[PDB]
Design a protein around this ligand. Sequence first.
Ligand SMILES: [Mg+2]
Ligand SMILES: [Mg+2]
Ligand SMILES: [Mg+2]
Lengths: 139, 50, 201, 483, 71
Amino acid sequence: RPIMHKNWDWEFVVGAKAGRKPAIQRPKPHQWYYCNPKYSAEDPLPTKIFPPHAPPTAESLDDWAKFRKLCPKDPVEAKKFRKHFVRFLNQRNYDWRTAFERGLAKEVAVAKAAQRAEDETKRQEAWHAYRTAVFESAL
Amino acid sequence: MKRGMTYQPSRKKRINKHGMEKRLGTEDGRLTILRRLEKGRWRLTVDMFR
Amino acid sequence: RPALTPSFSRVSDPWTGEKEAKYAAPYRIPEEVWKNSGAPKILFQDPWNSPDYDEVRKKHAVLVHDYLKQQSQPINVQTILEGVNKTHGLVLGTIEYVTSLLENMLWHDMAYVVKPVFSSPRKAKLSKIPLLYGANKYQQVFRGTPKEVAERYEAARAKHIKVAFTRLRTSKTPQPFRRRTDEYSHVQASQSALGLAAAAA
Amino acid sequence: FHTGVNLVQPIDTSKLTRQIKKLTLLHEAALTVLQYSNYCNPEQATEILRRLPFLMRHEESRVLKGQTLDPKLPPMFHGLLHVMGDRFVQVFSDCNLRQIERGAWALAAARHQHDGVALALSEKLKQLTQELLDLNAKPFNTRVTKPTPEQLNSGIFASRVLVPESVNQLPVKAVLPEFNALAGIAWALATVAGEHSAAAAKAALEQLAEKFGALQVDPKPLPDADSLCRLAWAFAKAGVHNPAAVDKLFHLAEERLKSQLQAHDPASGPLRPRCTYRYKTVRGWVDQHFPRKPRDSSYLGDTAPKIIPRDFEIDSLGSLLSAAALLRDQVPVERLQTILNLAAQHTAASSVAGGALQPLMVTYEEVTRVLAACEQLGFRSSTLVTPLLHGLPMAALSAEALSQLAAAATLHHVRSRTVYLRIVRAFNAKLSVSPTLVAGAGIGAEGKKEGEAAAALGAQLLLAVTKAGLPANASVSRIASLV
Amino acid sequence: AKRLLREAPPFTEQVDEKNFDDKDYLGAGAMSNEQLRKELEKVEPGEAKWDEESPLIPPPQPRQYRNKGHQ
RNA sequence: AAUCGUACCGCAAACCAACACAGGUUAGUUAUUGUAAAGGCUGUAUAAAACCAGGAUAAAGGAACUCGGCAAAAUAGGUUAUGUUUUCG
Ligand SMILES: [Mg+2]
Ligand SMILES: [Mg+2]
Ligand SMILES: [Mg+2]
């Protein structure tokens, strides 16, 4: 079994394409796998839950192993300690999405700006050729 | 201050205050059940479901 | 690729304060011949901006900033214009354009200005003596000349120590805390791979 | 004041500082380095260099039990060092003494050779040699209130928050207070020196050797054991020939070892080194000569001290003795013998509490490093080997390593039945049958030995045991029967 | 909120800065097996006695961590 | 290793107020020097009445207004040699 899923339909992830379960509009971390339009029953199930936004460097994370070592011995403090650890894990899923959305926006803006520069260049080149023809025609 | 918001729903409160287990715990509650059986109401308690 | 004005005396600068166009006719003609003839003016000059309007502006600022770093004393705007043109050629046309570039540097603390001392506000307003500008080797967080920056830092350092101990005395943390937010996702990992390929190539 | 579009710089200085302090992975570091390497001031450029050696070790430890390290990382680690090395040279003229220490150590620690840095360090070393070895020299002071125009070029004071600084009272009667700073820089120059910068580095070090030899005073705080080792290897690598300087350097090492033993009372417990205990404070950090009690803070999550050793340890003795072997011809025999005896006394006293033996843990790498130097120096002593064997685990060692250890003990005339039994017992449990003898692998050696190779290892162990004179035991009898 | 009353628990990545080894040592040019055999044979079989050791010897004690002063 | 929750709304046109109600509703997180990344949202067709509501400007005078400086306006901030009163802070 792999640790992370690698085959995602990126049109679905960004939001241009509908999913395999259209009734769900905002998949949960454990619902992403079965809402993928490329879902297949032959692929082995990953051993951990990650969203499509997670980086490939998360495969070396072992969070529950570290939690046990930091476990307080007082049950009253232990219960609150565990509650804060679960809160940290859930928040990490939505830090990745925010970085994912901000990172893509910068790439899109750069590409859009580059296209704008090229279009103006072609228009100015075309006009210059027309201007030259006018002078040549008039001798 | 604006009035009319005397109802603040709570599922745990509703079961404990008016539930069937509560109505059967006292003699007066048992009499209330009999009165509702005599009148022939289809639902006896707010706690009832199929 | 600087372009000359229709008077063939200077280059046009990329900013909103430039009121002269760029001559672009295939043949050189005096202004008086074609300006009063009645022909369309767009056949002789380009009144618009270049496709690289923003990139050219950033390049010009670097040239001005580098020249100041090579200087050892504050100088006037006129000296800056002559020095840059001599080093690289005719690329800047007016002192007003250089002034606009300097204002951007002053705002972000990439440069500083030395101002004269006047007895009354009215004398300062009516004064016409040119100003002197310098450059910081690295960006700073305080305004003014190096002497003024040191004075401002001293006041800031005292304030920080005053605040930190007052917080401790009133049962607050001496230094504020936050949480570390994870800003590395799949998009960032692909950017790094792209960057290495560009560097290798 | 810093709002809008900056036409000169792509990123604000304050934001760039935030990213540097927020680095935990090489991929994140590559993202910062490959974009804004040309806009770092000396404070930022040197900070990145110090972190890189630690980030590389972290990623090697992130690998889980059944995984392997990504092969693309080590190439990227050296790629980032080269890019930062170029920027270090560009801003080298504006660094402080402490900043130069950070950048130089990072490249030397990573064993990355750079001609541009080596040439820059060569000139700096010459300038600092005549200033830091002067008798009328003062310690480096971090308490700066009104910086000079040249100090504003270091980038320390371009900050929106409090600048941490040491709160200690600087000594006013110290001799050569910055000797340790000079020793580290010289060692980095020798290591970073390349093919085209070897001549310049050697010339600079030779002048330092002459200046060091022609000195009639000793620093009031004697140089740390680490600093002494670094300086000794700086001469050894560069090939500097100066017996006067070499002898003086070993004299300081001898003096420090005696001082540690003189000021030690065995009744207190096993010998331990003197260290500097650094704690975080409101305005920065403070250094103490002795540890605090454990404390619970209402704001800090970690109140533990950073321990910076000053005396010698087994780790440092294996590097100083290694340098001595390289520089044997330039050291008088009498001084070498004195240091060897002091080393044995230091080891013996460090593993004894009260009147009973209390072994101190050691690793196999450390033991081999110490023994290798002794073999080259031809020093045989049972007081230096016996403490090392008691503290050496013998559970994950290969059969070959156990055989070698047994041979070493016999040659050094170690007399301890416990040590011999712990070795033969481990070796017997590793010698398996099938009709071919197989010797297991382990930390000590790579691969397994089968057939004659296993028999040879058994014969050597039996020969060492026979010479030692151990009484017959089950483990030895089985080994003899198999071999 | 954004403002914390104390340092957050160590749930993020923790980069360790302890026990960093960067010292120089000798090479691996050790003696050959035959040389060791010859040396062992040359050892005189001196009939000496063993040292008086305590009945129970404690196991090795771990060493305390160390840092560097390049802060 | 079984069992129950997992769709959608959640400062709201979906919950408490008879309503698609200018009201009420707990906790956890995020960009931003003088600003502010992500994300989210959107109004039948005109105008040169009286009058009403919420703003702006105003010559000369400056509480003459009024039960009443109601409302509006106003250098508002910091450091001071000296003096006064104290329960001495
Ligand atoms: Mg949902
Ligand atoms: Mg008026
Ligand atoms: Mg009146």
